Every structure is written in structure tokens, then in C-alpha cells.
Amino acid sequence: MTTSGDPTAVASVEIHGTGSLGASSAPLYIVDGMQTSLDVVATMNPND
Amino acid sequence: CELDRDPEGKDFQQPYTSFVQTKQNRDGLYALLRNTENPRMHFYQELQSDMYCTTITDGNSLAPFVNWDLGILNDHGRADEDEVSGIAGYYFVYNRLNQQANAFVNNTEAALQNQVYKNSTEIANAKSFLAEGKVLQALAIWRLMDRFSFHESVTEVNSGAKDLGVILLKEYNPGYIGPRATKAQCYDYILSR
Amino acid sequence: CELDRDPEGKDFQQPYTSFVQTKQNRDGLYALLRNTENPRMHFYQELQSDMYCTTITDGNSLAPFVNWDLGILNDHGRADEDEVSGIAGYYFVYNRLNQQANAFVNNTEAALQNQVYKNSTEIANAKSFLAEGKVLQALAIWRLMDRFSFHESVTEVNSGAKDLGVILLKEYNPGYIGPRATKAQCYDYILSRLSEAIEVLPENRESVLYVSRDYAYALRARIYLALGEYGKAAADAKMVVDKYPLIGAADASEFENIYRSDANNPEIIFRGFASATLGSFTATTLNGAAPAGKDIKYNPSAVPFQWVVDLYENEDFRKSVYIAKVVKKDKGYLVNKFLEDKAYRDVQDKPNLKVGARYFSVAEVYLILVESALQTGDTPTAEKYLKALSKARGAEVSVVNMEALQAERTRELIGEGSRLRDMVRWSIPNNHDAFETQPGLEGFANTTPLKAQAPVGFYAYTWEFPQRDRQTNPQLIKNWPI
Amino acid sequence: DAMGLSISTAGNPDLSWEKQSQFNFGLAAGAFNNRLSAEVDFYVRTTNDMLIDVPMPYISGFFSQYQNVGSMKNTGVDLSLKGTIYQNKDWNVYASANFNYNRQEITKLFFGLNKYMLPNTGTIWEIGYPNSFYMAEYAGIDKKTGKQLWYVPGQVDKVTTSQYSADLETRIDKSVTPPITGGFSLGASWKGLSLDADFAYIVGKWMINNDRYFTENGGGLMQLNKDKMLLNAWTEDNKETDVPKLGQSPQFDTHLLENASFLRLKNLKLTYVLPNSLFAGQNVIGGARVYLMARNLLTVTKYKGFDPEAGGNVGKNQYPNSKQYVAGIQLSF
Amino acid sequence: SGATTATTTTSNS
Amino acid sequence: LSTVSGSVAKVSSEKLAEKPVANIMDALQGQVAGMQVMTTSGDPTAVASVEIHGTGSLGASSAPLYIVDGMQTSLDVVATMNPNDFESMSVLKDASATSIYGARAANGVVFIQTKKGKMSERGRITFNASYGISQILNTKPLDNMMTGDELLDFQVKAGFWGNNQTVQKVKDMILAGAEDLYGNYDSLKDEYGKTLFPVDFNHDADWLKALFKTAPTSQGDISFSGGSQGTSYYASIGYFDQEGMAREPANFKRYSGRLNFESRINEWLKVGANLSGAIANRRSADYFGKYYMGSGTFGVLTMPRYYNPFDVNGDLADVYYMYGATRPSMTEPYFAKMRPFSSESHQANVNGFAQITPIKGLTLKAQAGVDITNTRTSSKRMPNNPYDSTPLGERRERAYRDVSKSFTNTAEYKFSIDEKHDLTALMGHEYIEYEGDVIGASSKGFESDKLMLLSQGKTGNSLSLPEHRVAEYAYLSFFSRFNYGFDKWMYIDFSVRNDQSSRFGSNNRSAWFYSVGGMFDIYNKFIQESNWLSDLRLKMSYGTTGNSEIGNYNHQALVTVNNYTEDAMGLSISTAGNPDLSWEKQSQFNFGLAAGAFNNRLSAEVDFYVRTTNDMLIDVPMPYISGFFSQYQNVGSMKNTGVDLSLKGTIYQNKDWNVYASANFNYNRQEITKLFFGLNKYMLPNTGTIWEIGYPNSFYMAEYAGIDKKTGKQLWYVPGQVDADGNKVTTSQYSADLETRIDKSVTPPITGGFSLGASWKGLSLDADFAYIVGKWMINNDRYFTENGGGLMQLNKDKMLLNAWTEDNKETDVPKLGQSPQFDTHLLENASFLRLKNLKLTYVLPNSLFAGQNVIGGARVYLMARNLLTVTKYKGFDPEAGGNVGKNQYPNSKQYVAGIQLSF
Ligand SMILES: CCCCCCCCOCCOCCOCCOCCO
């Protein structure tokens, strides 16, 4: 679910419900072996 | 490969490495003691004496102490971030001073035996600083034992709480679940400090 | 492609079309004046007199001026994008002040003639601003003529330069090279600026941080005294001497607390704006001070002679403010006038030795009035003001006979750089080799002879033109024979 | 003048990492020549040692600690299925669908406690239920006097009062995280000319509409524009309505909980690959492609506030999602 | 750091 | 790259590979004829100064254009590139060769090409590693200074400590009151006398050991190179680390990477990319070049030898004592510990090109690239320092950013109009852009070293104002070049370009330049066969180029903020401006002759050039009555005439030996032909130099004669006066009218070098020499160590003991109380010959790697840099200078031992 129609807004993704109370529920984003953040993947051309 | 990442912009509790850290932690201990040993904390045991009479300006605030209302005094006072007052506020500020003094004294002793002080002036000053920290520990434990432990001339008590003191904690840990030490151990601890 | 690239934080030079543009360029003129007429530029003409002895701390910075080293003092100082100092820096900052006051005055004259101001209060304020700029042109020309032109009691000069002044520009253009004016032309220009500016500025002082009529009277009296005309000097000093009270103190610490603070000193006719963040500077040459925790420790590059210390009686208030016994922790005296001001402090507990610029105080108007009254043959006025000044300072003079005047003027203006002009005007030779040093400071302050003897009428009392001039225009006649 | 220093947050040297154990059982099947394909998966996901800033006892000398206490269990089933529906040599029709149902339950809290309410959030953690909403129920109005009425927690006969207080809030049986998630899709391609459509639904999602605190408000904030249903307010002449009198201020009760379940036509593309016979006597250009796309074209919702999805637990002054029309080229030369 | 000893020639080229 | 009729000198890859410095142009000293490389500091972050064919302008820069693979770069960016990635370096020192480059290509162009992968069946993997040490090269000038006892006796006799003073009184009650200062500090109170003697009159302190050290240097890189039939790649990752040889810390460190990629897509397209990046840490010793007390080589010369900075163990202390001080003086390792400084700079250069051949003939090429630098530096002043002026600390953080873009689009059509007539036409476009900014913030008033974030300072009058600086420019350019070639032996080249820059006014910014060149191959037409001669070409060129390197906003008349109060703002006048600032035009005629010999075993080149700078950009010295320091103007002219000749040989002996040699030479005569304000000469004040019409940039000072043996005074020659038969006339009164233009040039005329190389079965030895002849420098440190007039607290030279007195009356040094002048007795002859590097390498033989297929080669070398110098300069270094030798960071001396595994 993406909570804003802002062009600089990233989505909130939950796999199998919310796990914790008082912690984050975002997954681990890996791009080509090393991990990233969603704001960094926003700068990569998705046709690659 | 060491993977300790210490926070930049603040210090944290650890054994000391310099004399300026010891001096600054001592000044913070005294600024903490100023808000603990206040006249405003000792007014509740002044009003519970036989020398006061409440007036019509009261709003049942100074009234549970002068009139001996044993239903309000059983769980009185609050110690959240908005206000520290009452019997719970008394207990909170004196256990807070006891834990901070424990941290300062144990860190200064570890720094004295670890030989981190350069000249002899800093060693002599740090030994006097350690003695001041021990006096503040004895003051905190005595001011808790004064109100929360029974005098010997008491008739009827809970079964087992006749010769018990306060929870004698000697190290720094905020999460501590322990039993009450006996009264003799608490008085020997104060007098040895 | 458009290839137009224009700077950031910088606008273009335009003629004045508003009233707020005139106010902005006037405030820029005053902030330029604050970095010109500050005590750091008048230390060179103070050390060159016969009152200082270099210590062993000196790294050849003050030693050309004290010991009169004419091989260095010919081409001395820098003025570039790194440093501005020396004789060349003294020349550059007053020529820059003169040119920028010219630009301000001509632009606001043309804006007054083109009728770009709205009301009548804007016309009145613009005319007051014009007179305040005319005073600053007068000050810049006079302070260049003070150092780079001969007094009339000079013997040997470069042939043709005894009745010459400085290069006189009366309108702003930076592309002008020309010959030197005469002394009469420059002095009529200075006095025309001052007399045209007294008739416009109001009667009472608007602010202590801006030019008033009191400052124009005080500057005109100073120029008339240094010219050699005592009647007009007394007549101009009489109009400003009774509006500013002296410091009323009972002991030396009260005099230190009222004297050192610019905001509470009740006898300042004109001074520059200074805060802890804008307008303050350290002037630690004559005393060599350095903060250390909460106190001050001194390492001076030059200390006064014993005859300078013996001018002050032991109960004088200036013998712990103007000179202090702080060399080698208690052993000797230094000139401690520009120490500090406790208002311009980062933390109130720790010193940073920052002062501000003061342009005139009333204790020089008293000395101008006493000297002019003594020279024009008026004895009750000279006593009436010398007893008042010396009793407010702590120790009163018994007899007034122009030896007391010389002693009191030497005692009162120390560090301000007026002794070289006085010992030219009074026909006093150097005698630096004959003086003894302070006996408590031996090992630190010792005997160095002069590298050039300076009798009465020596050419080297006035400075030589810097060597960017005499190179860029060869119709400039230099001063010295060598 | 001199700096002093003192301990302020207290830490703990036994911070763990929020442990989790997950058990999984799945079954995958493929029907006639791998055309119809199905997949079903059951999971139990248990979390222990969650990170809470718990309120400490008074011997600590601090107010909180950040320790690892708690438990939680997520039980669910998710299934997906693909299919291909030919009718010809050229035609290709295909379809797909997903479904996921997830039930959250809190198991245990910190210090012997059975129920904890985070301050200034509006939720409640109760053992045996998911994290729910924490508000006062709203009965309606009383048409004898025209005043608002809230239910009482307990007191079953229920009993309603006309005076709001903070001791009237209770646990609402509507969860914060929506339980049912899915999405299905069609597709058809004649010869080159393809048409794809994707739908995505979330049902079970509740959301506080915070702008209806202002746009339907009888007393206060009177300079703003209001809703049209304030034109038949309760007076003594018109007393058969359900909107209150004009002198009252609304609360954050459960008349602001809206049902933000939706179904969104997330994508709809029309592609046309240019045919191979057009690039015949040439070796420069290899192929081409044209497409027309529409994003967020159609939405089926009972919400009242410009977007069900834009938000998350509360809908403030929000940026709604966009509806886009895109045309595109591709020259694979 | 320290005290600066004067009489330098200014370097150009 | 260039034209056939151009003067191009190519430097191979074996002159760039194994060098222990981050200064790549320092490797080219004595390698190109006419190119004069001088590096004036041994700092690891210092950079070289290049002049091709003499200095060209009096106010603008004379540096060449530095170009790596098409994009023009600064020299600090090339400092962050691994030089094992460089294939060659070609210096285009002509007017027919620098015709498609146009920013400041009147000064020459240095073109650097990076390696691309030579394609084969197996790629190559090389692994280089290296380690070495670096020292100071000259510790001779401090063998003449006084000792401690001699200095105290000289000071006592010279009256420095007072009249009637015994050496024992000054020794005891004056100077050994260092007990009083050390007794006030808790860390030195109980350490004085036990392990801390700050004043020592028995032994003599070693200040060269206190102020300088032996530093390390290391580097290593792994590099892969390959390619198929169409594509090719070269990748490289590396590491370089160099420490400075002074105790005041200076270091250079970088981690680099490079991928060069080149691909043939299909029969009309070819694409390519040259990606590079680095992470670099710089730090420069930023107190050198000025005179402080115990700093630099001035500190090793002039500190009194009875001042001890050490312990009783021999290790360096934290403080020392100087008499009269009010606090102790920190040593260099302790001052570098209470003032930290870190820099981290991220650099990325991405280039790329696409080349299209639609028809046979023309070739449309497009090229684009960007260089991006992001620097972030931080400095502190640590709190709770006992030996400071305040117990409070400060911190300053700056963030720099530079971004440079470039685009270049050409279209070349090459054809043959007959059988034996070749033509070529090229036209092109070029756009260069730059923008950069610095932002900065500060904070003061910290009390503990852990609470030192920038948001944790005092919040009253301890606040300050930030820093901000923006700069930008742009260049637009169009060009065209035509070539014609007759039958094979006559070649003509023509060229026309148009240049515009943002640094000039809106109606003065565009200029037109042209070039005509020609080559004639005399051997392939006239004498087509001979027994000894093998090649003979004769080339000749005339061209016009421009120079525009002055600074961005120098033609506007500006106004800046000069606030008075804290209420309203104020505006002051900044600059005067020059509305008709334009380019500086340079025309160059070149005539050269290249010849070969016995089957190309000997070869030679002779070139004669005339170079003329018209309308030169002088930063003119406006007189002080204007109120401005200087102003850039288009006034003046200059001329450089010279010859440069080169020759390569091979002198070898047997089947296994291979001995070769080379040499260079260049004489260059400058002449100023027109100055600025209608002047015939201008004397630059406090430099010691002059610009006079008709002569080069010369020196300008009085001529020291000697001393008067009857009085003891200093004597100078009065210029242009001879008495009766005798000698010239002298005088003892120093006047400014005694200054004469000396016939000694500021910029050195003669420049060259040579080389030797021998080999054997694997073992090889190489030696390169570089000499500069005609250099003079004013020794400024001999003003401080050779005078009895002032500065008597310093250490002096041993000659001042034998001074003139009425008793000692047959000396030659003057009397005591006299200041020296900057006259001819301070001009030293700084010409030198230096052995640049001496390499001894040994390729391991192919017999050892017979059966093992994972390692295919190995190579071991020893190397020594800067290990011989032949001078007459008494000043620690002749090269560090440029008319005045100040407190200089001398050049290093390296010993490096590395390996290379080509596995
Ligand atoms: C068609 C050209 C596209 C190029 C864009 C890529 C730009 C990213 O490069 C950023 C700079 O970083 C330099 C990479 O360093 C080279 C590392 O490679 C060495 C490893 O083998």
C-alpha cells in the first residue's frame, strides 16, 4: 500500500501480516547481492 | 574485526578513561542530589506530625497527611514524567540517586585500579571524589530506610516484615528484581560507607 | 546557448534611485571607516617616538619603528589580498576611504539634483547624509597629509617637496594618475569640507555611532592645532568642551569599569559600532596579551622607558589602567590601554581581549583648549580646564606653565599615536640612546641603540610614499633624499 | 560555568533481535497438460521477544527501559491459481488469481499484564485479539432532545449516556491491519494486439476519516464550508432526523471509523507489436511496438474521503493517488 | 604556531 | 590526434608506471624538449608547475591544457588516477597540433590516453605491489650553524641579554627560570628535573630529529585486460598511500577504480565508455612557506641548541620552553593531536562516445562526459588542553561540490579525389561547463570530547556566521580542420576555430583563430635510397591561438555587503571592472627538421620557434590612490624565441646486451616588448624583480661590494660611476637609488635531461638525469641566520663569531649592529643536475614457469628516486622556489622495492 500520490513517495510492503509491535515490518530489499533501501531503488531505471 | 559503534554526540556509562570525565560525572551527581534532597520532598513527613491543621483552602491534597487517611496513603503519589511527587515520588528520587551514585563509585574504582590517571594530583583528587560518592550512597540508603523500614517499637505489622529494610542494591542495574535485605545489613552498609 | 554567468552575493554599481539605497551605501561607508580608523593602524607612529624599548620577544616586527631602521622603513608594509599592514597599508586604507566617500557624495548629489526622493524628510535626511560624507573626506585627506607631508621645520628634503601635499582626487575615478598637490590646496580643501559640513548638520548629537556637529568641531580644532593656528583652535574647541562630562570615579577600579566600557563611557564624541559578533577586534601589539583560562598573561614586544612611568604619580587612576605593572607577573609596566571590553565576550567568564574603535573623546578637546589658551596668552582658561581634567583623572596639577601641559598631554594620550606629531611640533629631538630602561625588567628589556640618529628637522619623521606609487606614475616627487 | 553529566536512558546489555519461528505446509498441483495450475500454502508465524519501551518499577530510577518482552502469532492461508483458455490458433486468453487470509493474535505482554494501551495512538493491545481500535461507541441521537449519545462499556440491558468522558472508551472489534488481501488478472492476445487488465483488492480495512471532524461540525469551526446534511439539523420543528443540534462539538468516537475496503483496476494496457512483414527490405530497424496504458482507472469503495488507500490508520489532509494515461513507443532497431 | 618573524620578501613568480 | 605537420612528443608507458609519488607530471622532468616541469615542494599533496616554451603571459596562467581521454581535467583530479592505467602521454607543443582544443591551448596540450584491452583468446591478469621509504635529501646546511655554548657566548658579548652580564648569570638566573613556568602545570610540575630538561647547556638538542622523520609509502593494484573480436575491456582496482616526511602531518591516500569498455555493436555503430572513480584522503602541511618559531626547515636552522624538546629516553616530549614565554609551546606530534583534521573526497568521471559510419567516408562521432567531486572536510580544536589559551574546544565542517560537463560532436568526411590526391575535412562543436560551491558551518564552546556534534555549542555570543562560495563558467566552441596530401610526400593542413567564453563581456566574448601547417617528406621524393640515411622530414607551421585563464567575474563593476549594525545592511564597492576585457592572442611560428639514421638506430629532431603574445591579460597594479589592489586588463606584449633539439640512439654490443641513450635541450629567450601605463619599466615591490621593455623578467637589487676595513660598515657599488683609474665607486649609505637591473633571469633559460639504459639476460638498469641551468634564487633564510643587527635570539651561522672589531680587523663579515639588505649577496646560483630515478629490474626467466599454468610471469625491481644532486645552492633545495626560497618543504628521497606477478 502506497499512502501518498506524491511523486517522491515509496510504498509500504508487508509479507504475511504485521509481525511485531513497536518495530518495522518492511522486508529486506536486495539488489544484485547487496542490500539497498527503497529510496535508492527509486533512482534505478526499472527496465534493467 | 571489532564491531562496536559508539554514539557520536553523547557519552554512555562505562569505566572512566580520564580525569575530566570523572570531574564532569561528579558535577552531574551533585546536580542530581540538589533535586533529591530538597525541602519540597520532606514536607509530607512534616504534615503527618501533630502540629498542623488544614484550612478551607485545601483541595484534599495536604489533607491525606494531616488527617491520617489510610486509604489514600496506601498507594499515594506519582512518578511519571509530568510530575514526581508524593510517597512514590520520594521512593523514586532516592532510588535514582542511589543508582547514579553506585555507577559513579564503581566507575571511579575501576578507573583507579586500571591506572588511567597521569600524575599524582589527579589520583589524589579522584580518591577524594570516590569518598564523596560513598557519602552520597550512605545518604540515599539512610533516607530510604528512614521512611520505609519499621522502628523497633512497633506493635502490629505484616507477618515477616518486622526486621526487614529496603532493597539494598550495590551495583548499577535499572532492571533489578530482588528481595528486601535485613535491617542489620542495611545499617552496617551505611556505617561502612 | 546563453553564456552569461553573473556572481552570487554581488550586485552592480548603479546610480541612486531610492532612499533606502542611499541609507545602504551610507552604512557601508561607516563600516568601511571602522576598519580604517581603528587603533591598529596608529601603532606604527606611536612606537616610532622616544617612549618605547623593544624586549627580547621581538621578532623584528616593531624593531624597525622603535630603533629607526631606515633600510626597512623606506619600503614597508603590504596591501594585497592576503595582508594589509604597514606604511603601505596605512596609505591604502585612507585612499580607499577617500575614494568611497567620493563615490557616495557624488552619487547622492546627483540623486538630489535629479529629484528621486519622495517627501521632504527624505530630502532633509539626504542633505544630512551628504554633510556626513563631507566630514569623512576631510578626515581621510587630513590623515594622509599628517604622515606623508613635511612639517615646515624641516632641513633637508628631496628637491622640490617641502611645500607639497598628497595626490588630491575630488571625484571618483579609479583610472587617474597625477602629480602631488601643494599644502595650501589640500588644507583649503579640508577646511572647506569641514566648514561646509558644520552649517548643515544639526546642533545636537543624533547618535554616538554617526558623525555629528560635535565631531566636526573637534576634528577642525585638532587640524587647526596641528596646523599651528591657536586662535581658531581655541574658538572651535570651546564649542564642544562643555557638553561631555568627564568620568567621575573614586578609585582605580571604578575608573577601570567606566573607562573600558564603550556603552557607559560618558565622554565619547564619536565611536564605531561594536558587538561581540560584529565590529570587534583584538589590538594586542603594545601589550602582547593572551587569555589563559580566566586571567590574562602578557608577553610584550616593547615596554615603556622609565621616564614614561615616572610621569604618573602613585595615586593616579591611569597608572593601573593606561599603563599596568604586569610584565614578568609583577615586575614592570606596559601600555595596557587597549586591553579588553567585557561586553564583547563569548562566555562572560573567560576573556577574549576584544575592543572597539573610538574616534574622538573629550579629554583631547581639553588638551587642545589648554594648549591654545596658553599660546594665545589666556591664563585663567588654561587653569580652569587643566585642573579639571587632572583632578578628574586622579592627581591634580599644581602649576600650569606648558611643562605641565606637555606632561599631561603625554600622560593622557598614550597608545593613540600623538607623541611623534607633538615632538615634531614642540622641537623635541629623539634621545633614545640617553634614556634608561626599567630596572625591574633587566634581561627582558635591554639597551638597543638607534640605527639612525634623528635630530630636530630630520626627514624621516614623515613617511615615504609607498613604492606602488613612484612606479606607476613617475610625476610623483618623493619625500626623502635617499 | 563547568559541564556536568548524568545517565539519562539506562539501556540494557541483553538486547536481543525479536525472535521468530515459522512453520509452513504447502501443496502445488498442475492440471491438464500444465494449463490449470494451483498452489495452496498454510503458515503459522510466531514472534517472541518484541521490542517495547515498557514502564519500569520505581527502583529503576528511570521511567522506561526498551527491553524484549511479548509474543504474537500470525496464522493464515494463501492460494494462487493460473489458467490458459485457448479457443483458436491465433487467440490466447489467460487468467490468474490470488488470495491471502491472515489472522493476528497477541499472546502475552510484559509485567504480568493482560492489556496495554499505547498513549496517544488510539489502539489497544489485548491478549487473545489483534491490535484493535480504542474508542467510544456512538449510539446516535436522542430525538426527544437532539443530543448525542454514546454507549457504556458493559451495562447490558445497552445503556446510553449523553455526557462524553474519557472513561467511556472501549475496545472496538475492528483490527488495524486488514485481514484479506488479493488480486486477479485477465489477458487476451489476438495476433500482436494484446490487452491486459489487473485488479487488486483489500477487504477488512478500517480508517478514521479526520476531515469529517471538520466538514460536518455543528458547533465550532464555523467559518469553514460544511456538509449538506447540516441543513436538516435537529430542531424542535424538524425532530425526525439523525443529525444532532447545532450547539455540540463532535468527538473521535466510532462515527468517524469508515470502511476503506476497495477494489482497484490497477493497470490496463493495450499493446500492438508491429508485424514482421513490414521491415522487409531493410537492415537498420529490427522491430517496433506501441502501447496505450491507463493506471488507477476505476475504483469501487464505500469510503467518503478521496482515497481509501492513501492514509493508513487515519486519513488526514491527504495526497490522493493519481489516475494516469500513458502512450509509449519502442523501436527495437 | 608561535610568533612570526618578520622581513620576508613577497614571492611573485 | 594531431596533425602530420605538428610538433608532437610522445612519452611511452614505461616512464609513467612505477613512480612513488602522486605527482604524475614530476615523472616528466627532463623527458620532453621545451617542457619545463618544476615542483616546488615535497608535500605529498603538492602538484607540479608546467611551462611549455617559456612563460607566455604576465598575469594569466601559463599551464597547459590537461586532457584525459577527451575531457579536460584539473591536475588534482589526475592526482586521483592510478598511473598503471595510462598507455601513453603526448605533449602537443605546436600551433598546427593544438587546433581542435581551445580553452587555453595556446600554452600546449598534454594528452593522456588510458589503456584498452588488447583482445586475444585469454585475458591477462597482473598484480603489482610495492613498498618503500622516503627521507629528506639534504641535511648539509645545518652543519654550519652555531652550537649552544657558542650561541650563548655570542649573545652575551653582543649585548642581547643586557650590559654587564656574565655567561653564568644568563645561564642560571635568566634562562633556567623554566622551573617557574613548568611548576604551574600539574602534568609538568612533578616531571621537571626527573625526566624533562627543557633547558640543557651541556648537550645539544637535535632539531632535525624533532622536526622531520622517515616516512612510508605503499601501493598495490590488480588489473584485468581482455576482449573478443568485437569488444574489449580493461578493469583495474588499486590502492596508494604516501606519508609525509615532516612531523607536521601531510598525507595522500586513495582507493581507485577504472573500467574502460569498447564495443562494436553492428556494421554502423561503435560505442564506448571510460568509467573511473576514487575515494581519496588528502592532508597538506599548511604552515610551510612562512616563518614561525619552531616550524619547518627554518626551525631546524634557527632554534637555539640549548632548548631541548626531548625526554631522557630520547623520545619527543609534549612541550618545550622558550625564554619569556607565558605558556609552553607544543611540539608537532602533540599539536597534531589536539588539532585533528580529516578530509574525504569522492570522485567520479564518466565519459562515453557513440561513433556512426552511415556511408563509406564520413564518421559522425558524439561524445559526452561528466566529472563529479564531493569533498567533506572536518577540523577540531580539542577541549581540556592545559597548554592552550582556553579550555573550550571548537569544530568546523565544510562540504565542497564540483560538477563539470562536456559535450563534443564531430563529423569527419575522408575521401580521395584522384589516385594520388588525398583530402580530409572535419568540423566540430564543443561545450564545456562548470559549477561549484562550498558550504561551511562552525561551532565553539565544547567542554567534553564526546559531546562535540556541531549542534552542541554555546548559544549566545559564541555563535558565528556560515561560509558559502559559488563559482561557475562555460565555453562554447566550433572548429574545422582540413588536410591535403600529395602523392605521398607533401602535406598541407588548414584550420579555423571560433571560441567564446563566459569570462568576458557580452560583446567581447567571441574570437576567431586559424592555423596553417605543412610537412615535406624529402626522403621519399628526392633521395629515395641511401646507405646511411633512413628518414628526413621537414615541417613548418604558423598559427594563432588564444588564452583565457584569468578568473570568472573580472569584467563587472560590483558591490558587496559590508554591514555596520545588526539592524540594516550596508553596501560597499568591490571592484572597478573592465567592460572591454577580451581574449589574449598568441601567434606562433615553428620550423622543424626530423632526421633518422642507420636503420633507425639514431634519430634526431631540431625545432626553432618564435612565439608572440599580443593583447596580454595582465593583472595590472592599479596605484593605491584608486582604492583597489589590482585590475585585469588587456595591455602589454611579450615574445619567446628559442630552439630545442632531441636525439635518441642505440650503442649496443653483443647478442644479449642492449644499450641505448637519449638527450634533450632547450634554450629560451624571453623579451617584454610593451608594458601597461605607458611605462618603460615596472619594479615589483618586495619581490626583488623588474619588468623592463626589451629584456626578460630579471632581478633588481644593489650590488654588494664588501666591507670597509677601516670602519666596518657594509658597502655597495653606486651604479654607473667610475672614479680615477682605480676601481668602481662604493658607498656606505643604503639608498633605493643603488638598485640595478641584474642580467639574471627569473625564469630559467636552459632546461634539459638525458638518460641511460642497459640490459642483459633479463636484468636491466635505467638512469634518468634532469638539469636546469640559468636559475637564481633569493635565499631568504640567510637573512635570518647571517645578521648581527636584529633577531638575536635565533641561532646564527658560525661566521658571525669572526666579526669586525677594532681588535679583529682583517675579517670580511661586517660589524655587529647592522641590518642586512636584500642585495646581490643573497642571490644564490640555484642551477642543478639531478639523478631523477635509478631503476634496477629483473624479469624472471621463462624456464621456471614451464609446467605451472596459473602463473605466467614475475618481475622484481629496486628503485631509488632523487638520490643525487649537483648544486651550489646552500639552502636545503634549489628546485623549491620561484625567485624566493622561503621556509620550504624540501623534495623527498625515495627507496622503493616492488614486485609484479603477471599470472
Ligand atoms: C553507457 C555508459 C553508462 C555508464 C554509467 C555508469 C556510471 C557509474 O559509475 C560511477 C563511477 O564509479 C566508477 C566505477 O569504478 C570502476 C570499478 O570497476 C572496477 C571493477 O572491476
Side-chain angles (χ1 to χ4, degrees), chain F residues 224 235-237 256-259 272-273 275-278 347-352:
Chain F
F224 318 95
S236 188
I237 59 167
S256 317
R258 162 163 306 274
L259 179 78
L275 320 171
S276 157
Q347 180 99 43
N349 318 111
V350 293
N351 307 341

Side-chain angles (χ1 to χ4, degrees), chain C residues 221-234:
Chain C
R222 170 199 262 168
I223 295 165
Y224 270 149
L225 179 84
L227 211 42
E229 322 193 13
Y230 294 111
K232 305 194 146 191

Side-chain angles (χ1 to χ4, degrees), chain F residues 1-161:
Chain F
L1 183 65
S2 58
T3 41
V4 182
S5 89
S7 186
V8 181
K10 197 182 182 186
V11 181
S12 173
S13 166
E14 325 311 331
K15 319 291 190 179
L16 313 166
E18 283 98 30
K19 301 301 177 177
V21 287
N23 208 0
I24 178 64
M25 226 61 62
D26 182 44
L28 267 75
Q29 179 150 15
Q31 292 294 320
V32 192
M35 180 193 193
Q36 183 179 250
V37 185
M38 310 221 77
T39 181
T40 75
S41 161
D43 208 38
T45 79
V47 83
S49 157
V50 184
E51 260 165 358
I52 310 181
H53 296 167
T55 192
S57 195
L58 285 181
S61 177
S62 301
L65 204 62
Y66 300 114
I67 283 182
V68 191
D69 276 308
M71 281 204 68
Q72 74 192 22
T73 47
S74 42
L75 218 51
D76 308 66
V77 163
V78 178
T80 53
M81 292 184 191
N82 195 30
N84 314 340
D85 303 340
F86 293 161
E87 177 67 27
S88 74
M89 181 167 315
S90 64
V91 183
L92 324 173
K93 36 187 184 69
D94 216 359
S96 178
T98 78
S99 57
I100 59 175
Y101 316 106
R104 50 159 197 275
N107 301 321
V109 182
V110 180
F111 204 102
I112 301 163
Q113 285 182 356
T114 45
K115 281 172 185 164
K116 62 176 211 63
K118 272 142 170 62
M119 64 225 76
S120 52
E121 193 96 10
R122 292 177 66 250
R124 203 187 302 121
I125 315 154
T126 62
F127 168 68
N128 309 270
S130 158
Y131 178 81
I133 57 155
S134 158
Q135 289 193 345
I136 190 179
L137 85 172
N138 198 37
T139 82
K140 183 202 163 324
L142 72 162
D143 286 329
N144 263 306
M145 300 294 131
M146 284 176 188
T147 59
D149 294 329
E150 300 177 354
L151 177 68
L152 193 64
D153 219 318
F154 167 75
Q155 282 175 340
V156 158
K157 285 189 187 173
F160 177 60
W161 296 112

Side-chain angles (χ1 to χ4, degrees), chain C residues 3-4 11 13 24 34 58 69 75 95 209 273 275-276 291 293 297-299 346 446 451 468 471 482, chain F residues 160 324 326-327 389 461 502 509 557-559 564 566 570-571 573 575 622 624-625 629 683 686 735 793 819:
Chain C
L3 301 167
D4 278 8
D11 218 354
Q13 291 173 196
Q24 278 166 347
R34 189 177 55 208
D58 205 15
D69 197 2
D75 171 35
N95 277 278
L209 319 164
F273 181 83
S275 163
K297 287 195 289 201
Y298 305 91
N299 195 9
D346 295 351
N446 314 301
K451 302 216 190 307
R468 182 155 293 189
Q471 291 288 331
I482 44 157
Chain F
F160 177 60
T326 52
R327 66 179 61 97
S389 48
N461 302 273
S502 69
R509 68 167 81 259
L558 298 171
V559 153
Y564 188 44
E566 306 177 343
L571 293 160
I573 283 160
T575 40
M622 269 193 155
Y624 281 153
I625 59 182
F629 300 121
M683 190 268 304
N686 280 115
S735 178
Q793 71 260 6
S819 314

Side-chain angles (χ1 to χ4, degrees), chain F residues 680-693:
Chain F
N680 198 276
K681 68 194 183 185
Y682 179 74
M683 190 268 304
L684 282 86
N686 280 115
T687 68
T689 57
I690 191 170
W691 303 336
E692 188 166 359
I693 290 184

